């Protein structure tokens, strides 16, 4: 609740962004938060298959209704709960908060960095991060540069 | 002492070549009735015992978590992420 209050709201773009590290990010966030009503589609499909089997073999309607309810109950039981989903949602929310803070700083300093950005684009043809490039340069200096 | 003479006689002397063919359909029907009354009745209790501890004590099932720190990348309009491994522990009692 604290992290979700700090974040305010979550948009699908950030979920897609975090899909890089958590492919099941949406499947965990849906079980963690009351975003949309979740129907046991797989359980209902299994129940429909059992219903077809019962119709083919002439089983009682009570039996086929029970065999439809049972897979639905199993799906609901395996769906609800799952506090591991809450843990992964906490991780995703931390990632999203950090991303939003960095984005806010970017927007704040866009005008200040506009002028420097043009010469950096006109001088450096690589799109890699300045921090990574500077770390690589520091390593290169530490290795090759003569101590003298 | 109980007068178990007839039962003792039966136990001592029994046929050793008599067998009865079993209706496969009826045997399967009874076995699947047992399977139905097992899954659809006892699985509720078994899954309760298995999962309710996992619902009321989740912190013990997820030992390690990750934390992130972000820095801006203005010249490329990117976001740089630094990760960290932490031991999943309670917070803000
Ligand atoms: C990833 C890959 C996974 C693959 C999974 C594969 C699963 C395969 C499951 C196969 C199930 C086969 C079931 C066959 C049932 C046969 C029943 C039978 O022969 O008896 C028929 C009998 C008829 O009823 P009656 O009232 O006598 O009426 C007369 C009609 N002539 O009817 C009766 O008396 C009632 C019969 C009740 C049957 C109950 C069936 C319960 C099945 C529970 C399955 C649980 C699986 C859990 C999987 C979890 C996975 C995470």
TrEMBL record, chain A:
Q: What is this protein called?
A: Transmembrane protein, putative
Transmembrane among keywords: yes
TM annotation in the entry: 37-57
Sorted keywords for this record are: Membrane, Transmembrane, Transmembrane helix
Organism expressing this protein natively:
Tetrahymena thermophila (strain SB210)
- Which portion of the complete protein is shown here? 149 to 296 of 296
From TrEMBL, chain B:
The answer to whether the entry has keyword Transmembrane helix is yes
Identify the keywords attached in UniProt to this record, alphabetized. Membrane, Transmembrane, Transmembrane helix
Transmembrane stretches, start-end:
32-50
Question: Which named protein is this?
Answer: Transmembrane protein, putative
Q: Which organism is it from?
A: Tetrahymena thermophila (strain SB210)
**What are the leading ranks of the lineage?**
Eukaryota, Sar, Alveolata, Ciliophora, Intramacronucleata
